[PDB]
Structure formats: C-alpha cells, structure tokens
Write a protein that binds this DNA or RNA. Sequence first.
RNA 1: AAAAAAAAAAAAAAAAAAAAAAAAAAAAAA
Lengths: 45, 83, 99, 136, 217, 120
Amino acid sequence: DCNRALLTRLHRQTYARLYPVLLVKQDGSTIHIRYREPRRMLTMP
Amino acid sequence: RRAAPLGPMPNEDIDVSDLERLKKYRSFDRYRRRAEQEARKPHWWRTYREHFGEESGPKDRVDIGLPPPKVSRTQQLLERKQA
Amino acid sequence: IPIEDFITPVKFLNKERQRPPVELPFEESERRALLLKRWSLYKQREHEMERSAIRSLLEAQEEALQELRLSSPELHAEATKRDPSLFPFERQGPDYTPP
Amino acid sequence: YRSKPTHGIGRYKHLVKAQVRPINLGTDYEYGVLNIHLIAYDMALAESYAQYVHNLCNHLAIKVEESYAMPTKTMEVLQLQEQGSKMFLDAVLTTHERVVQISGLSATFAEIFLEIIHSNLPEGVKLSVREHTEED
Amino acid sequence: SPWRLLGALCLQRPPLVTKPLTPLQEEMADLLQQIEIERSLYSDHELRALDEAQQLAKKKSDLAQDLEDMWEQKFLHFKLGARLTEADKKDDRTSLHRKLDRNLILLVREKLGDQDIWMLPQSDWQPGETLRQTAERTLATLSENNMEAKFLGNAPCGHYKFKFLGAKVFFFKALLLTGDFSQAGKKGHHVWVSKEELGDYLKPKYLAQVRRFLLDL
Amino acid sequence: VARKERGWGTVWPSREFWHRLRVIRTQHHIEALVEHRNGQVVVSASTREWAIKKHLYSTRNVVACESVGRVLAERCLEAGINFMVYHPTPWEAASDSIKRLQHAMTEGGVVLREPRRIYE
RNA sequence: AAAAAAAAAAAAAAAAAAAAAAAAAAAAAA
C-alpha cells in the first residue's frame, strides 16, 4: 500500500521543470525529492 | 384553526435531527430528476394533472389485439450477451 | 495570520519561451490512452480490494467487540473508551535505502 | 394557508441550515476535533497523500471540516568545506505541510483508521495526529 | 458459567523500506514523467544550458556540462545500503531485521504440559486488571527485550473464544516504534514473519482468523 | 394557430412549446426523447433498445449521442414532425455530446426552435 | 428463508473536496 498515492505529477498551472533527486538525510536513508536542479543526488550532514 | 394532513405530507420522511449526516444532491440535475419523479405521482392535493386534462387519466384498455409473439427469455438474453 | 504558497512566483514570468513544442503521432496518443484506460481498471480494482479489506477488518471488529460485551459487561465498559495514548500519534513513512 | 390540510407544503428552511469539545462518555465515546498534519519535502507527494486522506474520509463517512495548507518552511543547509577549514557552503530546501481536520470519531474507527493511514503512507512522508488548538 | 481470561497481542513491525513497482505502475510512472516534464516551464539549469549553448556559437562566429559531469561522478562515487538484508542470509525467520519491504509479526513456540502450542503472543489478565495493562506488561516481560511500542486504542482488534469452562482470547494491536532485543540467542523461539508466512505457520482456527484483521498490504 | 402554454417563468424550463427535445443522460445510456406538454413522449430514441445497442459500441460515448441523434432525426421525419424546442442547461449546452446531438438533428432535416404562434 | 424489474436506475480514472468495470451452480453458500 506504500505505492497508493506515490504516483503523481504536480498540478499547478504554470511551473518550472521538475527533476528526480536522491536525497540523503542523516540516517543512511534516502528519499526522492522532485527538485528543479537536474543533480542526481544531494546529502545532509 | 389547523387541519390534519391527508395521507403523506411530502417531505416529512427525512430526519431534521442531524442534517450534516444526511446525504445531499449537490447537483442541479439530480434534483431536477427526483423532482419530476415527484411530478409524476398521484398527490392527494389539487394538482396540474387534475385540472389540465390528462385525458381520462387511468383507462382500462379494451384491447383487440394480435396476441403477443411468443419467444423465450433466457435464450435471447444469452444470445444478445454473446453478440 | 494566513499566507499560502499557492501563488505563481515572479521568477516564472518571461522565461515562458523555453517549452513551446509538443507533438505526438497517432502511436504515442494511442499508447498513452490504452495505458490510461487500463490504469483506470486497475485503480478501480485497487480501491475495491482496499474497501473490502478494511470492511472485513471492521467485521473482525464487529465479531470481537460483540463477543466481548456478550461475555463481560465490565469489558465493554473498559475498552469502549478512548485512551489518552492516542493524542500525539506520530509515524514516519518508509524510505528508499535502509540506514 | 393555515386552515387547509396542505399548510406547510412549501415550508423548507428546517431542511437547509445556513445560519470545540470532544465528547468522552467512556462507552459511546466521541473524540472529535482532531488535526492531521501531513508534512513532507515534496509538494506533489504532500498534495497526493492529502488528497488520498480527504477522499478516504469522504468514503468512510467520517466528516472532514477543514483541509488547508500551512506555511512552508524554507531551509538553508550549510555544509563544511574541507579545503577552507571553517569555510561553509550552501544548498536550499523547502518543507511543505498540509492539514486535514476531522470532527468526529469513535474508538473503533480510530483503531481502524490509523491502520490504513500508516499502511498507505508514501516514502518521504511524515504524519501527525493532534488536537484542534494551534496558532497560525 | 466460569470464564477463563486470556489476554493476547498482535505485534506489528513497521515495513521499513519501500517496495519496487508493478509493471503497470511503472509504465504509469514513466508516463507521468513525460507529461510532467512536458508542461514544464524552462529550467534554471536548462536556461543556462541552452542560452550558453546558443551564445557560445555567436562568440565563436563573430557551464551546464561541468555540473552534469560533477554530479554524475559524485553520485556514481557514492554507494548505498543494500535493499535486501533478509535474502543474503535468506535463512532467518527469527531476525527482527529480516524483511524491509513488508509488515512483520511475532510468533512464539511453546509446548505445555497437556498441549502443543504455536503462540501468537498471549497474555493472562486478572479480573481486576485492564486488558491494556496486561497486554503491555506481558509484552515487555515475555520477550526479555526493551520495547518501545505505541499502541493505538483502548479498544481491541479481534476476539476468539475456546469453551471447554469457557474462555476468551483477546487480540490487540501494538505498533512497534523501536525494539531492543536482549540475549538475541535465547532458546524460546520467536518467529518474525510476513503476511504470507502468517498464512503458513498458523495451525489454530483462532489464529487462522488473526490474518483476517491483519493488514495484508 | 393552436394554444401554446405561455407561463411559469418563475420556474424552468419554459413549458411553452408544442414539442420539446428531452435528453436524459444516464451514467450508462443516452436516451433522447420527443415530448408533448401532456407529458406524453411522442417519438423516442433509447440506447437500451436492442436495435442501436447491437449495432455500435460503448453506450456512453459521444459517438453514441450522435447516433441516437440521427436515429431520432429519421424517426422524426417518419413521424413527420419537423419542429421541437430544446432547452439545454448552460453547462450542458457547452458540452460536446450535445453539440453533435444538435448537429445530428440539424442534418436530419429537423428544426429546433418551434415556429411562433399565430395571433398569440 | 442467493453489480456496493424480467435489463434498468452509488464507484473509479481533465489549491482539497464539490459540480466535461461489471451481475447463485446442475413453476418443478441469513
């Protein structure tokens, strides 16, 4: 059921280019942030 | 001087207690439909139908016919379904 | 003292010139449409199975609680009340890579 | 017309009324005024799960009152550069928050609800159950 | 009509890391990828990419690549935790670290004097006690672990009676936050098991119906 | 020369007509009718009728509204009536199914907008 | 005592809601 609401686009009428980003907070965990910078990955300390 | 309603009074059936929990027609349309439904029943009060000559209202039909063509139910239902 | 983020920023005004073209053959159109219809069927079965799932769950609740009252009245006095432990309920969603 | 059998035919306004406490009785126990905070980094994600919640409540007969978006929180993250010793570098993020408010509950519907809630939770999504008093 | 009072508990482990997608969900995923980047207005990266790609030619006749390659190498250089900590062992049903994708549940092995019992953990609650109290107490005491588990309600999940005497087994749901399991090698057999295994390992018809109020996911 | 029913005008739709186009759109089937103010439906085209039901696909479609339209059109000239009035709803009048309904009737040779009365 | 009349009238998929896929087994399983 984790994939229930996971499938979407941003519904605002006028908006920037949104690119898939892998984000590491401090866990060892990773998230997918849709963010305007094409960069493959970012990580927080 | 108040009188007594004769048979049903139209909206009486729904509960005024707790209106929030009752479902609504949010649509002009649904309303229209349910409306005309209520326009087609025999009300106990003077109505349009009554005065405006529905032309005899209910008629017991003297029917001189060709008796109805006899075919089978489930057969045709299946055939249709397949088609 | 309300401020929403809904408004369209001034940054996005005149850069509008970047994405004019879009064109599809009957093929991309057809593909995406089939995909859509199929997706509708799928999601519907999904909502349906979800609903019957939580429903059957709630029937386990029915049988349970009715059994508890039919057994012990003290037990439907105890457990029919909502406890203080639910107040700050917080849960974090799953992630992509384990820690 | 008062004297007729038909008086009150047209009468309606009792039908549409166009014109807070949790009730805890310990048996039929109504715990109302509940606040679901949905907090995440992704707008599409947030809006999606919010949508799913709101709709879910619509189907479960549990009545939703207010669904609204709380102010976004803008983070500036400073990362240590190794070359310059105490030198800082920067990257920007934003946290978005949605809220769905339910006016009524019972024990069994909470037990039931929380299950579907955290079961259907998305990746990168954080959830909160609270009480109505908060300050904007 | 004497009643025998037995508390019981359904112990739910949170699914940790997300599942990969149905082929249809994937096709839909790529589809929404396309359509979203379709209605996309410019990009700062794409502005500085395309404007400089066009401008360098007119400083030729009369950057973005840097960043692209920097990020390629910085992501490739990086490494991640594995998605499977179960199947590389592939063995342990008893590891609490086993299944990352699904929700997990505790079982126990007991052979009692007159009986052979496969036990979804059960409690004995005294008539004065509240089902709550005995649920928690027996939980923390039975497994010899330090367990942070946030329960949902004061109300129970599901109830199954065995009448010899007559008796009740009351199942509750405990949502596990963080467990600490002491003496990881203790003899008492605790089986941490998914939905599919909750189908298999369960003999009783009392426990056969706990997978009925379970979350299948 | 006959009498129309002038009136109402508190309510909706205007019940002034000899003949009216009544289109009832169900989630399943399109049913377009021709009405008399006696409430009696004169000539009707329904999707639940095996005749159209079996010839084409997907009852709810725009294709189907057009269909039922032409059907009712030929059935109209068969009845011989060239005139019925249509009162769409503002949000309905804008929708496509009804646009091309109206074209099916136009090209059928049927006129909407009943001719005016004589010495009204 | 067999889809959530003899085929019909909730549900799902283009700021959050709201408003252009289907149907007891061979009259005589509560």
